[PDB]
């Protein structure tokens, strides 16, 4: 059922957990570094878990997709063929920016954080800077122990702060991926949909130095020996059975003003969806004719597809439940309730007015702000601006450097510059530059940027072509040239004739000004947001509703039971799918082109010892009433005894609007059954070495 519960809320969900069928003790789940919770790890935007004492990690294929793609070429395309390392020495690097974060410690720093903010006084920009300085110092201190990366989280609009410390594993390797037609069976047609028949799994191995301590990739590294790892269920999961997930959901907006919902539904989602679908169309068309573009842009395209479809589904779910009307009426109820409390309601009413003004300020420049950010996110302009900004930050003392540009960020910056080599083709990026130039040019005069207008020197198709031809002279297309500029100083950027560098130098003062506006608004938000959101929490509790913070990339638990849902009268979706449903969808054309060994094995009824007699087949995917969102992909699903019964990977179509208004009847998790992972690894794309390592072969 509903709720992305923080670990600190275990006392309040202990009852409900038991009633839903958890047979582990709650104290046993309270130990975040114990068995089984200490097996659960963050990947940075996905979740994973250890499944062996020798550092084997299981996550979704969608989570490993970037890594698989980094190791793919048009000639040897692992997205298409799968990957399998018969021995650990055959594992390939997942990329310099791949990470496994292992939870070490959580600390409440709410009192200190809020005192740092208060000490800033009246000024909005100082208030941002005070919190930043607080955060940097705290993190520096936490990260004094080598091998650890720390993160400060704000919950419930700034009403609580906790610091997380994680062991940061920095040499993550790909151990196994099923073929794409298993890992992403049904592609974007079945994305966000049930019935689902997708084997969405892959494995990494975590590596450390011979001294036990995290290190970047080296042939001298050895597998990490985790303290805890998960075991596969020995009991067959069935309909109605208890399941729980622990993971790292990214963001939800269930506490939001009506107007923030309205702007998102009316402007933000449709705008992004359109821009993404436009770029998908260009890249798809180009990749049809160029297999190198197809493979190099596959991960970006997966992202654009997944997001745009998610947004389409949100817009549709808003209309289905009247989200606009729900938000309007809830807000009128909270505002009435506050007005009813006389004096002591006033600070929240005032906060609400301030929040609404800050939203309006945002809105006045939204087209400009989005368009410029996304133009600057093409590969060469993104490289140029990031590296020119680093050269500026490098002249300040480290503690004063912008977050993202401190010494502790240098590995990521550098690794990103290298990864891009497998994700850039000039003739493709040019078309993307051109798209964004044409969108920039449609902005009205009051949403234009002087710097970009001057640089363009014109407002028509000719000026666009002349600018593209100028940018094509960049030398940032090569990894070595980017790394040169990664180390160069500010003066070297300002003397350069590279046309992408010249763009960056020309626009940088404008980006820096926009950033200060954003920091200023954020500082006002620091004042207003916690007061209003506490009012919202207090009102929800007076209504007897569940109270838990919006997602914010920190660890949460959700729990419930295996069950289907009813999308309309006269029909029900069943909780499971089966092997014969996979074959029934076969067309022999992407995305419905399963491996021939799959089609053979199902035809021969080779169930591999994994049949669930209650469904007459091996289960493939299942529905449950858990509350998950983006960032939960890869989260283990545990049964009543804390055994692995699947991985979380998607939501059904009607669920996605729950980011803004929670609908219990149509909100489900889609997970891939542990038995299907094992079945694929036995009958279809064999990995007997891994099955043995996990004690299931």
């Amino acid at each position: 059922g509903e709720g992305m519960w923080v670990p600190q809320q275990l006392p309040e969900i202990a009852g409900p957990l038991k009633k839903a069928g958890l047979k582990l003790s709650p104290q046993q789940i309270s130990d975040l570094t114990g068995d089984p919770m200490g097996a659960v790890v963050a990947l940075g935007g996905c979740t994973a878990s250890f499944v062996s004492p020798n550092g084997l990690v299981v996550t979704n294929h969608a989570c490993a997709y970037g890594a698989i793609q980094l190791n793919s070429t048009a000639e040897n395309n692992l997205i298409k063929n799968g990957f399998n390392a018969p021995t650990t020495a055959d594992e390939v690097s997942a990329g310099p920016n791949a990470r496994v974060f292992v939870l070490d410690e959580i600390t409440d720093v709410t009192k200190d954080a809020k005192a740092a903010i208060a000490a800033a006084g009246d000024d909005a920009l100082a208030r941002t800077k005070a919190l930043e300085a607080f955060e940097k110092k705290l993190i520096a201190d936490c990260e004094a122990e080598a091998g650890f990366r720390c993160r400060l989280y704000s919950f419930s609009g700034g009403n609580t702060y906790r610091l997380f410390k994680n062991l940061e594993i920095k040499d993550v390797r790909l151990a196994y991926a099923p073929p794409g037609s298993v890992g992403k069976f049904g592609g974007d047609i079945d994305n966000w949909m049930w019935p689902r028949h997708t084997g969405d799994f892959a494995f990494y191995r975590a590596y450390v130095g011979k001294d036990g301590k995290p290190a970047a990739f080296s042939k001298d590294n050895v597998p990490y020996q985790p303290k805890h790892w998960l075991k596969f269920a020995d009991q067959p999961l069935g309909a109605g059975d208890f399941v729980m997930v622990a993971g790292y959901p990214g963001s939800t907006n269930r506490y939001a003003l009506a107007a923030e919902f309205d702007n998102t539904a009316q402007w933000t989602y449709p705008t992004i969806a359109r821009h993404y679908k436009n770029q998908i169309a260009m890249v798809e068309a180009a990749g049809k004719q160029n297999a190198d573009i197809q493979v190099k842009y596959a991960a970006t395209m997966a992202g654009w597809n997944n997001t745009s479809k998610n947004y389409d589904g949100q817009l549709e779910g808003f209309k289905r439940i009247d989200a606009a009307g729900q938000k309007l009426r809830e807000e009128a109820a909270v505002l009435g309730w506050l007005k009813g409390q006389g004096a002591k309601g006033q600070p929240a009413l005032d906060a609400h007015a301030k929040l609404l003004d800050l939203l309006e300020q945002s809105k006045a420049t939204r087209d400009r702000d989005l368009t410029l950010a996304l133009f600057n996110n093409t590969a060469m302009l993104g490289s140029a601006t990031q590296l020119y900004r680093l050269s500026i930050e490098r002249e300040k003392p480290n503690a004063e450097r912008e977050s993202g540009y401190q010494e502790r960020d240098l590995p990521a910056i550098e690794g990103g510059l290298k990864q891009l080599e497998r994700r850039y083709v000039a003739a493709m990026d040019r078309q993307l530059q051109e798209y964004w130039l044409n969108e920039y040019i449609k902005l009205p005069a009051d949403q234009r940027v002087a710097a970009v207008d001057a640089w363009l020197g014109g407002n028509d198709a000719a000026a666009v072509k002349r600018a593209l031809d100028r940018l094509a002279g960049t030398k940032l297309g090569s990894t070595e040239e980017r790394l040169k500029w990664f180390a160069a100083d500010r003066k070297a950027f300002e003397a350069s004739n590279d046309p992408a560098i010249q763009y960056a130098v020309a626009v940088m003062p404008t980006l820096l000004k926009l950033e200060q506006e954003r920091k200023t608004r954020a500082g006002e938000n620091l004042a207003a947001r916690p007061v209003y959101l506490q009012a919202l929490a207090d009102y929800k509790k007076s209504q007897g509703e569940f109270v838990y913070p919006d997602a914010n990339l920190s660890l949460r638990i959700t729990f419930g039971n295996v069950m289907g849902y009813a999308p309309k009268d006269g029909m029900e979706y069943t909780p499971f799918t089966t092997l014969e449903g996979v074959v029934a969808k076969e067309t022999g054309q992407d995305p419905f082109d399963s491996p021939k060994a799959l089609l053979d094995a199902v035809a021969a009824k080779r169930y591999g010892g994994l049949e669930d007699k209650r469904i007459g087949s091996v289960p493939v995917n299942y529905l449950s009433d858990l509350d998950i969102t983006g960032g939960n992909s890869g989260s283990p699903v545990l049964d009543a005894h804390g055994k692995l019964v699947g991985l979380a990977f998607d939501g059904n179509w009607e669920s996605v609007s729950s980011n803004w208004v929670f609908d219990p009847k149509m909100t489900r998790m889609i997970a891939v059954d542990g038995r299907y992972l094992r079945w694929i690894m036995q009958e279809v794309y064999p990995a007997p070495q891994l099955l043995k390592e996990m004690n299931v072969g």
């Binding site: 935007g45 996905c46 979704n60 969608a62 989570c63 994305n191 966000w192 969405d200 990214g250 963001s251 992202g303 997944n306 997001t307 998610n310 990339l553 998950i628 969102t629 983006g630 960032g631 939960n632 992909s633 979380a648 990977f649 998607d650 939501g651």
Partner: peptide, 5 residues
């Protein structure tokens, strides 16, 4: 898919 965009 519930990856984080």
């Amino acid at each position: 898919v519930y990856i984080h965009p």
